[PDB]
Design a protein around this ligand. Structure first.
Ligand SMILES: [Fe+3]
Ligand SMILES: [Fe+3]
Ligand SMILES: [Fe+3]
Ligand SMILES: [Fe+3]
Lengths: 310, 310, 310, 310
C-alpha cells in the first residue's frame, strides 16, 4: 500500500488563543475526516524552528518557539487515493467549513493543501516507551529487525523543502534515497524518513472556491457555507484539480530523537566527507531551490497509516 | 481463576488533610483486609481528571488535579469470591468501622461498593523499571511473550462507565472485547485492559446498615460501633445482598503509559476509521448511558491478583 | 392533574464563565421549551452544598459554593405527559442542539434526564414578600388555609436521593409521606415537599444518540446537528425510551426558608424521637442506598405548574 | 566466597560541614583500607529516613533528609576474614587515627564496628544504565538469568534490625530467607537482599582502647596517636576480640529501585495474605526486638565483592 498524503499547510499566530482553538477544533476536524473509509491516518505538526545550516539562515534557530510568528502548522491526512480525500471534503463540506471558520481567526497564511506521492520511505511504527520490551520480544520471535524507536508525540520531525530542476526528478530521488539511507545507518538518533513528491493541489482543501463561493465564505461566521464549487467546477475529482507546481517540489520528511539530534544529524551532509559527496552529487546538484529545513513537533498522530507502507 | 472485584467508590475532599488521612488510615484498612485467606490484592485509585471526548465534556480536562472537588477515589479489593469479602467485613467489622470513621471526615459522597465480575481481561503483572531486563530475559527463556510494561504506581488507569441496554449484554461484551484487543495491538502506550460487569453491591461495604445501626453509626466517633446488621439481616452472605443495578453497568478498565497516551489513545475510537466501526457497532449501539471515562492514578497497589487471571 | 417532571441532571464547572453561559443560553432553552402546549413550567436548581448528616458526609458542608467543582445543576421541566417533552425535543432538535452545544464547554458530567412521577406533594405556589398580604387576605376570603411562604428564587431546595429495595416501593412512599407530613406540621421553616419516582429516561434529553449521531454531534460547533435518532430509533415516544433504573430511585424534594433551616430541619429525623421512629421504620428500613441530600438554590423559576397539583 | 562484613556504624551531625569532611576524609580512609590484600570492597551508606510501618514509628518518615540529626552512617568493609580487617587496622593504625581524628568533629555517637556473617544472599552486581544492554546480551550468551538492575550509587538500601530470641536463630534465618525470596519473585522494584548475622565486634574499629590509649586519643588532634592496644591486649586477632551481642542481632539488607518501591514493597508483609503468613511465622515469631527498618542512600560503592558471593 503506497498511500497519498495531503498536507494542509498554514501559518498561524503564535499566541495562547491559537493553542486553545487547536485543541478544541483540531479533534473535530479529524473526527469528520475519519468518517470516510479511505482515511488512513494523520500527523498534526507544529513548527518549532529551522535548521540554520551553519549560518545560511543565521536569523533563525533550532528553537524559535518563543519568537516565530506566524508559525507553520502542517496537517498530514493520509488516504488510499486522491478521490477519497476529495470525496470526504465534498461529503462533509458544510461541517468542515463550520470548523475551519473557527480556525481562520488564527490564520495568517494559507491554507494550501498539496497532494504528495510517497516516492520512498523507511518509517517505523510509532510506539511508546512501555511498548519497547514487547516490540523487542516480538521482533526476535518473528526473526524481524527491531526498528528505531519512534515515540508517539515525543520526537522531532524535520521537513526539507527542495525544488528540483526540470528533468532531474529521478536523479534527485535516488540521491535523496542514498543520502537518507546512509544517515539512518550511520547518524545517531535518526528515527526514519520519507521522500514526498508534490503532484497536485486540492482546491477545496486550499479554500480556493469559485468567485461567488469566495464572497459567501466571508458573508458568514460558519453557519451559512457557500455551495461546493471551485474554478474547476463542482464535481468530485479523481485527480488533483490544481496542477502540481513546477519546478517539482519534494518534501524530505526526517524523524529524529530530539531537536539536537536533528540539528547535529542533518549537519553530517557538511561535516562527513562521504555523506557530503553523496548529498552534493545526489541532491544539491539537482536543485533550483533549497534545501530549507523546518523543525516540527508532532502534537497529535494517528499513525496506523505507517503500518501499511512499502 | 477469575476473582471477584469489589470496588469501593467514594468522592472525597481535595485538600491536604485528605492526602494525610489516606496515607495514615488507608494502609491500616488493607492490613485488616489481608487477614483473610480469600483476599488476593488491591488497587487504590485517585481520580486525576476525565476524558473530555472532543468537547462532549468540555468543562473537564485530562488533568483536573488542582480543581476537582470532590475527587473520585476507587478502592479495588480482589477476592476469591463474594463470601470471602463479606466474611472479612463481618469478622473485622469493629476495626474497619473505627478506621473508616476517621475517613468519613473527608467524604463528600459514598461509599458505594459494587461487586464486579471480570468478563475478560488482558492485564500484565505490575513491575518497575529495574525489573524490566530480567522480565525480558525470563520471557525469552520461557519462550513466552514479553508483556506491556505496567509500572507499579507509575501509570494511568482509565475507567469507562457504560450502562448497557437490556438484552444487549453479550453483544456489548463482544464489541468491547474487540475494541480493546484492537487498541492493545495498534495504539501506542496501551498497557492492558479489563472488562468488569456489576452483579451486586455489598451493603456493609457501602455503609448501608439497618436503621438502628445507622443511628448508632453517627452516635460515636469510632470507638462504639453499631451491631453488624443491614436491611438484609445480619448473616454473612454468599451472594451480594443488594442486587446489581439495571440497566447493567460495565466498567472498562484500561491502563496506559501516561495521561497523554490515554487521552490520545482513547480518541482512536473516533479518529481511526476501522476502530470507529468496531466501537460504534460493537459498543455505542448497545448503550443506554455512556461512555464516560474518568482518569485515575494508582496510589498504592498490591498486584499479585493479576498473576492469576485468564 | 399530576404532571410529569423531567429532571435534566448535569455537573458543571464552578467558575465565572459557567454562570455567564447560564445567563445567555439558559433562557434561550426555556424559550424553546415553552413553544410546546404541553409545557407547564420549570425550576433551574444550582447546587450550593450537601447535608453532612452528623459526619456521615463530613468532607462536605451545607455551604460549598466556593469549593464545589463540579457543581450540580438540575433543570426541572414539567409536562402534561412524556410525549409532550419528547415531541418538544424532536420539533426543536436543531435549536436545542445549537444551544446546548454552547453549554457543553462547562459540562463535566451529564446531562442525564430521567422522568419522574409526582407520587405525592404538598408544595405551595411561589410568591414574593409584597404578595403576602394579598395572599393572606385571599386565603381568608376563600376560607382556605394560608400556605407556607415559598419566596420566588429566594429559598432553599433540598433533594434527598433514595434507592428503594425491590418490593418495598409502596412501604417507602407511605413512610416518606408520613415523615414529610410530620415535618411540615412541626419543623420551623419547612416550605413544602414532593416525592418523585423515576420511571424512565429520555434518550434525546440525555444526549444519548445512535452511534453515527454521536460522531456527528462532536463533528460540529452547533450549526450542523446530527439527525434525530437514538439506539431506540427516530420516532417520538409516548413512553420513556430508556427504562427506569433499578433499584427504584426516589427523589425527595423539600423546600426550606434557608440553608440553616434545611440543615436543622432535616436533622429532626435524628434528634426527635417520634419523627425518628417514623423515618427509621417508614423510610430507612426500605433503602438499598441513601439517603443523600444535596442543597440547591433555585436560580430561575416558572412556577405555574405548582398551581395544579394534589 | 563467603566474605565477612565489618559495618562501621556512626551517627553524624546533619549539617553542610559533615558532607565536606566526608568528601575530603572519606576517600582517604578507603584508600588506606585498600592497601590490604584481604580487602574486597565497601559500601558507604547514609541514612535518609525510616519505614514508619503503618504508624508504629509515626514520628518518622521515608524521607527525613532535612530533619534527621544525627543521621546514621554505615560503612561496610568486606573482607576475606576477620584477621585481614584487624591486620589492616593494625598496620595502618597511625594513619587511620589521623584521618578519623578529623571525622570525630561530626560524630555524635559511635563508631561501633560489629562483624557480620553473610548467612544468605541474592545480591546482583552493581552497574549503570549504559551497561544494561551489554549485561543483557552477555546473559543470553552465557545462558544465564538476567539480574535485577542495581544502579551504582543510584538506588535505595534498607536495613532491618532484628534481635532474635535465644535458640530461634536458625528458624529466623529460614523464615527470613522465605520472606525475601518471595518478595524478590513477587514485589516490584526489589533489587536484591542479604541476611547478615552479628558474630563479634572490632575493638580497634570501634575506637575502644585501653584506658591509657583512651587518654592519649583525646590528648592529640591526630598527629600523636596512642599505642595500638585494647582491653584485649595489643595482638592482631584472628577472631573478634569483643563477643557478638545477645540476643543475636540480624541485619536484613534489602535493595530497592527507590524509596517508594522500598516503602510499598516492605509493606507487603502486612498487605499480602500469603507473605504475611510467611513473615509472621518465619520472622516475627522469633524476635526479641524489631523489626526496625532504616532507609539509606549508597553514596560510594566499590562493589566487586558482590561478584563472588553465593
Ligand atoms: Fe483536506
Ligand atoms: Fe470492602
Ligand atoms: Fe429535556
Ligand atoms: Fe574498620
Amino acid at each position: 500500500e503506497n498511500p497519498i498524503i495531503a498536507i494542509n499547510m498554514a501559518k498561524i499566530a503564535n499566541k495562547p488563543d491559537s493553542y486553545e482553538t487547536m485543541m478544541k477544533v483540531g479533534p473535530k476536524v479529524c473526527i469528520t475526516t475519519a468518517s470516510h473509509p479511505g482515511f488512513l491516518g494523520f500527523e498534526q505538526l507544529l513548527q518549532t524552528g529551522i535548521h540554520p545550516m551553519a549560518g545560511r539562515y543565521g536569523g533563525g534557530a533550532v528553537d524559535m518557539r518563543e519568537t516565530l510568528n506566524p508559525m507553520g502548522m502542517f496537517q498530514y491526512t493520509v488516504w488510499k487515493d486522491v478521490h477519497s480525500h476529495e470525496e470526504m471534503h465534498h461529503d462533509n463540506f458544510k461541517e468542515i467549513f463550520e470548523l475551519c471558520s473557527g480556525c481562520l481567526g488564527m490564520v495568517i497564511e494559507g491554507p494550501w493543501e498539496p497532494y504528495f506521492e510517497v516516492v520512498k520511505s523507511d518509517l517505523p511504527q510509532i510506539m511508546s516507551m512501555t511498548d519497547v520490551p514487547q516490540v523487542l520480544g516480538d521482533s526476535f520471535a518473528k526473526q524481524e529487525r527491531v526498528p528505531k524507536v519512534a515515540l508517539s508525540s515525543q520526537r522531532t520531525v524535520v521537513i526539507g523543502d527542495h525544488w528540483v530542476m526540470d528533468g532531474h526528478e529521478k536523479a534527485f530521488e535516488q540521491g535523496a534515497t542514498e543520502t537518507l539511507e546512509w544517515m539512518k545507518a550511520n547518524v545517531p538518533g535518526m528515527v526514519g524518513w520519507m521522500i514526498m513528491k508534490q503532484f497536485g493541489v486540492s482546491a477545496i482543501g486550499s479554500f480556493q472556491l469559485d468567485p461567488e463561493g469566495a464572497m459567501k465564505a466571508v458573508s458568514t461566521l460558519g453557519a451559512n457555507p457557500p455551495e461546493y464549487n471551485t474554478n474547476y467546477g463542482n464535481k468530485v475529482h479523481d485527480k488533483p484539480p490544481i496542477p502540481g507546481q513546477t519546478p517539482t517540489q519534494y518534501l524530505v520528511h526526517i524523524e529524529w530523537e530530539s531537536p539536537e539530534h536533528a540539528h547535529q544529524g542533518l549537519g553530517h551532509v557538511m561535516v562527513d566527507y562521504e555523506l557530503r559527496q553523496i548529498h552534493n552529487n545526489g541532491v544539491l546538484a539537482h536543485l533550483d531551490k533549497g534545501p530549507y529545513y523546518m523543525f516540527f513537533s508532532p502534537m497529535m498522530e494517528q499513525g496506523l497509516w505507517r503500518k501499511h507502507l512499502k
